[PDB]
Each structure stands twice: as structure tokens, then as C-alpha cells.
Design a protein around this ligand. Structure first.
Ligand code: HEM
Ligand code: HEM
Ligand SMILES: N=C(Nc1cccc(CO[C@@H](CN)COCc2cccc(/N=C(/N)c3cccs3)c2)c1)c1cccs1
Ligand SMILES: N=C(Nc1cccc(CO[C@@H](CN)COCc2cccc(/N=C(/N)c3cccs3)c2)c1)c1cccs1
Ligand SMILES: C[C@H](O)[C@H](O)[C@H]1CNc2nc(N)[nH]c(=O)c2N1
Ligand SMILES: C[C@H](O)[C@H](O)[C@H]1CNc2nc(N)[nH]c(=O)c2N1
Ligand SMILES: [Cl-]
Ligand SMILES: [Cl-]
Lengths: 362, 362
């Protein structure tokens, strides 16, 4: 059964992929090769062309992503050759360095050996390669609450955070055959961070806010033609609202709106004053200003939705069905000011794609 | 078949309604009476108790409405006795007067005779009882574009608008047996309007914006126990974002954000400045300020979502399933600042309920 699933997924993927690459005449022979390989080994190996186009198709098919206009320019790094934890560490360090590109962010994915029979070869524990620790004791929170459980697991492995609000978590991953993950501190020279200041309000620096430059999602499974790449970290650049309307604003994250209200000089006393809305706008202006001033890539939500509109037009022109998740594509501020809010999207799942998988901790 | 549908819908409604009213022992005899009445007449007549509770249940079941906490205090006016167009006009004038209540808005529904065999007795053409006309010629728009088609139809019936940006449309409705609807100008003494000013920015009055006090939806069908009340206008009060983030802001409505930007003294040149977001916040603060200053009821979106949270808790406490449409319940500004954004809702349709119906014009 598992073997039949693989072959059916393989057939669909190779046909579509080779059609897109103008290789339709080669499908028959490639599918023959594959069936034999599956018959003998219980699996098959993608060509570098298949793996690269597959990762790009997976991005193109991600219903929740507003940044898909740029799917075809994804930089795919093939690391299916790694066998040791030093090689994984160095590959993850390299990804950070080349994706960061001195601030001019390059969308990149590094692809590690895939699952064999559901057995992982490399298991990454981080949610993002660069993220801040979170702590709770004594009732008072320090850092990013979304990182509380992983931070606690790292402190079970001999690591200790300084307990600032912005401790960088170490890389943490497990190799097939090892019982415990290993961890490595991130070299600070690799990690660009951006201090948050406001273009007009000098007091805004009093909040001492910062965020990291490059979001690199490292806990999703890339599925391509029935092959499960559970370890394939990827990055784009931030849309500013992710930082300003969610990471720094959510009550269960950094919860900064009352402090923002205070430094911008407005009362935070009455719902009818819309002080939360006003604070959210100024915090989001500060995030965009600060990234731009630092020379780190970022996109505002209006420009992002305009880009997504072009992606919709591109799909229609290419004769491709468009899929999307309206509830995630709308930005969390001024959503009715974007075209997204005023149309609907088919939320069907199409493969290749990126999928959630169970956490190894918790 | 139609008759079977009616009986099945009647059974479900009477059982549930009488259960809620502590009248469970009367269900059997009432259902007997009903089946006979259906058998003889092809229909049945609600008691005043059934009609009143039915309208309230219909509101409670409206998935898209954030204001449902107050469903049980709906003021139901029974006008199933009307037979003439003068009686309909006077009933609609009365609804406006008693719902408006000098600014302290009372949620109210007036219920007219229902469809008989799909044949309407009274057919209301207005989308809302109080709404502004819209015109397009010469390329330039005047008034509310959402009213363009109905305004054109009214001008086919001998009415003529002054072509200001805020012309009040007349009431327009058709009686069973008449080929054309009749129209009646609204007495201005019945219509409260609110000029839009800003609490801190004096220049805001230069925009000369206003909106009407009471939104009274008059084109939906109330369905209760298989009976179709196609004419049953209802009103609550506004949530401020409806006016400030949509009616005055949408590009296909009054499209005022660039003018707002100008009077609040910010540039409207760069997406990264978030000038649309800032303009939206100040316009929405002005709307809430102006309604409050005029003594007209209105709710801000933060308070409304807090009320909706209580509605969710009330349902769970009463053992009632909650249904909702996430895509409409989230407010169009700062939606992630409300609890609504962070949970999900079952969008199942439950009756009694309010439904769209085909327009008689267009
Ligand atoms: C180039 C810049 C990019 C931008 C501005 C962008 C923007 C976004 C945003 C704003 C989200 C919503 C995230 C959230 O609210 O937590 C998102 C989701 C997503 N993006 Fe993109 N994205 C970009 C590139 C990429 C790349 C390169 C990939 C993969 C190759 C990717 C795959 C996804 C996926 C899978 C999700 C869904 C995550 C989930 O369900 O939790 N995106 N994107
Ligand atoms: C008491 C104050 C009320 C408030 C603040 C309120 C709030 C709202 C809001 C903001 C919407 C979304 C409208 C839009 O975006 O166009 C809505 C939808 C709705 N409300 Fe309420 N509402 C209230 C009372 C009522 C009443 C009294 C009824 C009926 C008896 C009602 C039935 C509905 C229905 C049917 C919709 C959906 C309209 C559609 O699908 O187009 N509401 N409500
Ligand atoms: N653990 C799960 N999933 C899960 C649980 C909680 C949260 C999440 C994801 O949380 C998101 C909340 N906003 C955060 O996602 C971060 C993200 C994802 C994609 C793009 C993001 N932003 C960017 N611009 C980019 C990052 C990388 C490329 S572009 C950020 C996932 C599971 C569910 C079922 C089985 S496992
Ligand atoms: N014509 C249709 N429906 C339709 C078409 C276009 C638009 C609409 C409704 O437009 C809404 C856009 N936001 C406007 O609804 C106005 C509204 C509805 C409910 C509550 C509203 N606000 C309030 N606070 C209240 C008004 C009355 C009680 S509370 C406003 C409905 C049909 C579809 C299928 C068959 S007919
Ligand atoms: C396509 C989309 O569902 C549509 O534009 C909806 C979105 N959510 C909404 N929500 C409310 N409250 N009112 C609306 O008119 C809309 N428009
Ligand atoms: C319940 C709801 O679907 C959930 O909170 C979603 C809403 N839309 C979202 N949209 C984005 N882009 N990111 C998110 O984390 C969420 N959260
Ligand atoms: Cl993030
Ligand atoms: Cl309205």
C-alpha cells in the first residue's frame, strides 16, 4: 500500500514537472526507471532538476503564502549528501549566511536527506533557525512565549539562556541513530538584527525593541512526488505586519501595544479612542522604517498584496488553477484595503507542498 | 413536496421554539392544529409568540453578525395586518421613528405579511430604508456607487435626485397586484444624520462628510418554520468600522482615504509609510467621536468583539451550538487585536434565519 501511494504520487509529479520543463517526451522512460527503482529499493531518488522544480512548485502551491509571485526564483541548495552532525551544522550555518546576503535577502531552501520508510535521517527541532528564547517562572515572562517549550527542552540538554528578552536559541537537531539531539550556539556574526526606531518619534527607542532579519522556517515537511523531505529549511523575507502586528503585538507574544501607546503620547484608556489601532500603525511604520534604514529586505502589506495580484494574473495567463487560504492571505492590518479581502480563493491542497509535522518535543 | 417541506420545517421550529419558551407540553396539540391548517389552506399562521421568538432566533443564528449578544432584546413589530400601500408606508415611517428613538437606537424588526405560494404580498426595493443615492455619467461619480442601479430605477418612476453626494433615496416598494412599485420621499424630520468631525484635527470638517444614524436592512428574507417573510426590515446600531473602514473608505464606495490623508497632514505617496492605515485609523476615530458627540448609538470594534465573546460564553452555558462566519465576524481594521481572529467557527446554516433574495430591479 505505502509503495502504491509512492508510485501514484511519483507518476503525477513527474508528468506535471516534466511538462512544465518542456521534457514531456522523457516522462515514459523516467517513469520506467522509477517503477523499477521502487520495486527493488522501496523508493526512488530525484534528479537535481526534479528536486529543484519540486521545491519551487511546493512554494507555488502554498495556499497561505502571499509572497508566491517569486516562486520561480527560489534558490535550491541540495544537501542530500550529508551524513554527519558537523555537516548538518555547517549546512545550516551556510544557509543563514547565503540567505542573509548582507541584508539583501535571497529566498533559499536547503534540502537534507529524506525519510526512508518514515524513518527520519535528520530531525530539526527549531521552529525557525533564528528565533528568540522564552521563559516563564515567578509569574513573569521573559522573551518570546512561543519559544517556551523548545527553550525548556534546550535547557534539558545542557544549554542555558542569559534570560534577556532576546536570547538567540541554539540550533538543535537529532541524527538518525542518536537518542538525543545536539545543540550549537549561533555565531553572532551570522545573525543580522534590526533595532526598532520610529521615523518621527525619538522616544520610540526607549522601548529597546529589536527583531532578527531573516525568518527561516525549519520545521515543515517538503513533499515531492511521494518523497518526504522532513528536513528542508526555507526562508523569504518578512512582510512587516508579521513583526509589527503579531510577533511584537500579540498578547501571547511580546505584548507591546500599551508601551507603544505610552511612547507615542496617547492614552490607552478607552476602546473608542482606537488606541490599539493607532499604536499598531505606528509600530508597523517603525518596523518598516528600521529594516529599510538597516538595509535589510522587507515588504509592506500593500506592496505584497499588489505582488500577489500579479501572481493571480500570472496563474490565469499560464492556465494554472489558483489555490489560496483567504484567512491567512489577508493581512492583519487594514485587510479591506487590499484586493485579497474582496475576493474568494479555492483552498484545495495540491502537491508538491509544505506540510506541518509533529514536534519531537512537547 | 412544497407542502411536505413546510410541515417538516414547522415541526422542527415549533418543538425548538416551545422548548425554549418552556412550553414543551403544548407542542403536540399545536402541531396537530398546524398539520390540519396546512392540509386545508396549504399554509399556517404563527402566533405572536412564535413570530416574536422566531425573529429573535433568526438573529441569534445569523453567522455573520458580531452583535448577537443582544438577540433576546429585539423589538418585534407585527404588521401582518397591512393591506394597502399607505399602511406599508406608515409602518416603515414608524419603524424609522421608533428604532431611531432620538438617537438611543432600539434594535427593531417590522414584519409584513409573508409569501403565500412564493407570491409576495409586499415587495420592498430598498436595500436599507435610509440610504444615499448614487449617480454616474460623464465619467465622474456622485454619491454612493452601491446605490447606482436602484437610483436609476427610481428615476424611471418619476423621482429625481438633487445629485448631491448625500441624496436620500425615497422608500420604494411594490404591492401584490401592482405592476410598478410606488415611491415616497422620506420626511427629513425622521432621519438623523451625523456630520463627521475629528476630536483633535479641526481641518477634518473640510471633507464635509456625514452618514445616517440608523442602518435598517430591508431586502432580506426572514424564514421561520417554513414561512417566508420576504418583507421584514430590521435594524441595530452601527459598528464604527462599517462606516469608517468600508462605506467611506472603499474605492468602489465613497473612496475618501486620499482626502483624509491630506487633511490630517500626511503624505499619500509611499506604501511603506502606511498612509492608508493611518488615514483609516483617524477616519474611524472621527466616526466614533462624531456619533458619540451627537448622542447617536454606535459601538467600536473592540467593544463589539468583547460583547461577541460573551455571546459565545452564553451559548456554551446554555448548551447551544455556536455558528459563525469567521470571514465576516473579523473587523476590517486591527482584526488580530480581537479574540475572533484567533479562533475558528462552524459556518453551518441553522433556521430560523435571514437570507438573501433576488433583487426586483437589475
Ligand atoms: C519572498 C518573500 C516571502 C514573503 C514576503 C512571504 C510571506 C508570507 C507570509 C506573510 C506568510 C504568513 C505567515 C504567518 O502569518 O505566520 C507566509 C506563509 C507561508 N509561506 Fe511565504 N513568503 C515568502 C517566501 C516564501 C518561501 C521562499 C517559501 C517556501 C519555499 C514560503 C512558504 C510559505 C509557507 C509554507 C507558508 C505557510 C506557513 C504555515 O502554514 O504556517 N514563503 N508567507
Ligand atoms: C444591535 C446592534 C448590531 C450590531 C452592532 C451588528 C453588527 C453587525 C455587523 C458589523 C455586521 C456585518 C455587516 C457588513 O459588514 O455589511 C452584521 C451583519 C448582520 N447582522 Fe448584525 N448587528 C446588530 C444587530 C442586528 C440585528 C438586530 C439583526 C436582525 C434582527 C442583525 C442581523 C445581521 C445579519 C443578517 C447580518 C448579515 C448581513 C449579510 O449577510 O449581508 N444584526 N451585524
Ligand atoms: N505544530 C504544528 N503546526 C503549527 C502549530 C503552531 C503554529 C504553527 C505556525 O505558526 C505560525 C503563526 N503565525 C508562524 O509561522 C511562521 C511563518 C511561516 C511561514 C512564513 C513566515 N514568514 C515569512 N515571511 C517566511 C518564513 C520563511 C519563508 S517566508 C512565517 C504551526 C502542527 C499541526 C498539526 C500537526 S503539527
Ligand atoms: N443580492 C444579494 N445579496 C447581496 C449582494 C451584495 C451585497 C449584499 C450585502 O452587502 C453588505 C456589504 N458589506 C452590506 O450589508 C449591509 C449590512 C447588513 C447587516 C448589518 C449591517 N450593519 C448593521 N450594523 C445593521 C443593519 C441592520 C441591523 S444591524 C449592514 C448582499 C444576493 C445574493 C444571492 C441571491 S440575492
Ligand atoms: C470575499 C470576501 O469574503 C468578502 O469581500 C467579504 C469579506 N468579509 C466581510 N466582512 C464583513 N463584515 N462585511 C463584508 O462586506 C465582507 N466582505
Ligand atoms: C483561527 C485563525 O484561522 C488563526 O488565528 C489564523 C488567522 N489568520 C492568520 N493569518 C496569518 N497570516 N497568520 C496567522 O498566524 C493566522 N492565524
Ligand atoms: Cl515569524
Ligand atoms: Cl451600511
Amino acid at each position: 500500500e505505502e509503495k502504491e501511494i509512492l508510485w501514484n504520487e511519483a507518476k503525477a509529479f513527474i508528468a506535471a514537472c516534466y511538462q512544465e520543463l518542456g521534457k514531456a517526451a522523457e516522462v515514459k522512460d523516467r517513469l520506467a526507471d522509477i517503477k523499477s527503482e521502487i520495486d527493488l529499493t522501496g523508493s526512488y531518488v530525484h534528479t537535481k532538476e526534479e528536486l529543484e522544480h519540486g521545491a519551487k512548485m511546493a512554494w507555488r502551491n502554498s495556499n497561505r503564502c502571499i509572497g508566491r509571485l517569486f516562486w520561480n526564483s527560489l534558490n535550491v541548495i541540495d544537501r542530500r549528501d550529508v551524513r554527519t552532525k558537523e555537516e548538518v551544522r555547517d549546512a545550516l550555518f551556510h544557509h543563514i549566511e547565503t540567505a542573509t546576503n548582507n541584508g539583501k535577502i535571497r529566498p533559499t531552501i536547503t534540502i537534507f536527506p529524506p525519510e526512508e520508510k518514515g524513518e527520519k535521517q535528520v530531525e530539526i527541532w527549531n521552529h525557525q533557525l533564528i528565533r528568540y528564547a522564552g521563559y516563564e517562572s515567578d509569574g513573569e515572562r521573559i522573551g518570546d512565549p512561543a519559544s517556551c517549550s523548545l527553550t525548556a527542552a534546550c535547557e534539558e540538554l545542557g544549554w542555558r539562556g542569559e534570560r534577556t528578552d532576546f536570547d538567540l536559541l541554539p540550533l538543535i537537531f537529532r541524527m538518525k541513530g542518536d537518542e538525543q539531539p545536539v545543540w550549537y550556539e549561533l555565531p553572532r556574526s551570522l545573525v543580522i538584527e534590526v533595532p526598532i526606531t520610529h521615523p518621527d518619534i525619538e522616544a520610540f527607542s526607549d522601548l529597546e525593541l529589536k527583531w532578527y532579519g531573516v525568518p527561516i522556517i525549519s520545521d515543515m515537511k517538503l513533499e515531492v512526488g511521494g518523497i518526504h523531505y522532513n528536513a528542508a529549511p526555507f526562508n523569504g523575507w518578512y512582510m512587516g505586519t508579521e513583526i509589527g502586528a503579531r510577533n511584537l503585538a500579540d498578547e501571547k507574544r511580546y505584548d507591546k501595544l500599551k508601551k507603544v501607546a505610552s511612547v507615542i503620547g496617547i492614552a490607552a484608556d478607552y476602546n473608542t479612542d482606537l488606541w490599539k489601532d493607532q499604536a499598531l500603525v505606528e509600530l508597523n511604520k517603525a518596523v518598516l522604517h528600521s529594516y529599510k534604514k538597516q538595509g535589510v529586505s522587507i515588504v509592506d502589506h500593500h506592496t505584497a498584496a499588489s505582488q500577489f495580484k500579479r501572481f493571480e494574473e500570472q496563474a490565469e495567463e499560464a492556465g494554472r488553477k489558483l489555490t489560496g487560504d483567504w484567512t491567512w492571505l489577508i493581512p492583519p492590518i487594514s485587510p479591506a484595503a487590499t484586493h485579497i479581502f474582496h475576493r474568494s480563493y479555492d483552498n484545495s491542497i495540491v502537491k508538491p507542498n509544505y506540510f506541518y509535522q509533529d514536534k519531537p518535543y512537547e
